[PDB]
Amino acid sequence: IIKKELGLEKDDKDAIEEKFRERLKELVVPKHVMDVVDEELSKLGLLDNHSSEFNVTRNYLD
């Protein structure tokens, strides 16, 4: 109850999702790269937080 969407509810990866989306929100972003970023985020959610390929994905999206 204390959480109210705090702490464990961020998952440490959807935080990256939100960070990237807000970072590119002000940008008038191309639709193509928009869907590519969506695919990258989908893979981010499809990959664990403790692996090398996930780190490479995070770096590429960075």
């Binding site: 959610g45 499809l46 990959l47 664990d48």
Partner: protein, 62 residues
Amino acid sequence: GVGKTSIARSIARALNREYFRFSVGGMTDVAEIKGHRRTYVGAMPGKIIQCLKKTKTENPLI
């Protein structure tokens, strides 16, 4: 752009069995064929499962 996919669609119509199409182009990860073990949150079935589910048949035209 020669209608090959349209040929497949017409064959499916002439065979009364559903139509589905799949893209293997440049894919290297057999995961999309085999999905993922479902253990990982975000793991997904292989596209064949999606095809069979949508086509609603065990004798579709793939």
